[PDB]
Design a protein around this ligand. Sequence first.
Ligand SMILES: [Co+2]
Ligand SMILES: [Co+2]
Length: 276
Amino acid sequence: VVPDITTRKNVGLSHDANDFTLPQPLDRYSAEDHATWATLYQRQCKLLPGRACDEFLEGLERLEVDADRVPDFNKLNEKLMAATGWKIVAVPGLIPDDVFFEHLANRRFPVTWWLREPHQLDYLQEPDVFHDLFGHVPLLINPVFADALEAYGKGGVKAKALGALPMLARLYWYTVEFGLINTPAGMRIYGAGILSSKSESIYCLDSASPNRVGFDLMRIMNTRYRIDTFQKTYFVIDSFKQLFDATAPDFAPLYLQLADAQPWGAGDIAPDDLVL
Ligand SMILES: [Co+2]
Ligand SMILES: [Co+2]
């Protein structure tokens, strides 16, 4: 057993014991880190036109996400706060789900502060600052998307009280992390896990292999996912409004009905799916 990357990167740093935040450690970014950031940024910006939803590419520009260095979170926050009242907060790496949703409930988006090493350029399993900031943050300037996230966050309390955090986590995964959005110009991507990826960005739109299924709240909350492979199923929304509107009803009876149900496997098609 050797220390994992999260442990190694955080040596000598602390974090709040309750909310897991710390000030962004600006001094810890090396020349190599800025170069790695610049390489990832350039790679994604070459790949994503015609694949990412237009709002994502626009958000990168409106927030002035740096092309050439790891961004200063405080500086980005000036723009994000003026747009939708959100801010990003630095965290050490993966945090508990209850803490994560509590941040979202308060319009704080947690971002892992450290970056993958150059040898991990192609892929990192852990979240890092490229995935969290480049992948997740640009859409937070869209007020409908931002409201959906806040609503997910507020749902954390009820989910925790009912032992249903994993059901809310599935909704988050299949929307915020791996969601597709249909447009008159064809299918586009809004999931951050795809937007920061070297290759999943290609597969999710070009391959006949994955299922593309119309968004359905109950179906999604009853669907397993895997973290270590490309998604076998992507869920497709018509608009960010659909995401927000999905949060309108009381989730409590949905959780209880699902508590004793057998969940769908990551690759299953349910009898009632709208398959696209
Ligand atoms: Co700790
Ligand atoms: Co993510």
